[PDB]
Amino acid sequence: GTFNFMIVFQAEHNILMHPFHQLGVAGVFGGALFCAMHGSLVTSSLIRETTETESANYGYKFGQEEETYNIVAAHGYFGRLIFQYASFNNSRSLHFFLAAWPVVGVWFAALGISTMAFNLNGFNFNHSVIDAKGNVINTWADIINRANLGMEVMHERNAHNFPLDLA
């Protein structure tokens, strides 16, 4: 039923072509990326507190006062992976970013659905490119349109009596 909702939504609002959903994707793709990033960087710089035969997780004790990884070493790594000023050396700023990126993106995703609720839809570039004579030169937007038309004509196949699906 979730997938049904998504496909029909695409047919009626062209959500893929809506910048708020695109922001949403940036939020979740980026949130996953930054999750893997932060996970890998902290894990990469754990201070040796255990033997080869035991899990490194026993190197941290719940409620210990000392930090369990070396952020300066993590920064020294990531700053060299890209460049120095592209990497965080402030943990508070780093974690704020981790909070803000997916949260803001998902806010925009929520707003996409909440504003397509009132039929302000994704960008429509159907037949936007025209040649000298006036022949329509299709773009990938028009191919998206053909897919959307397939969903539109088929959905709720017995529900429509009149030519326009107005809600």
Partner: protein, 37 residues
């Protein structure tokens, strides 16, 4: 001379240049090729 033109002026002018060029790109969405007309 390394420091004569203040950075805030460079940022403001550079930023304004970005707005103008992107603004031109948006204008072009409504005229000529890709305008649907």
């Amino acid at each position: 001379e390394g420091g004569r033109i203040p950075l805030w002026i460079v940022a403001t002018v550079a930023g304004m240049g970005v707005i103008v060029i992107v603004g031109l790109f948006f204008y072009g969405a409504y005229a000529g090729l890709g305008s649907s007309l």
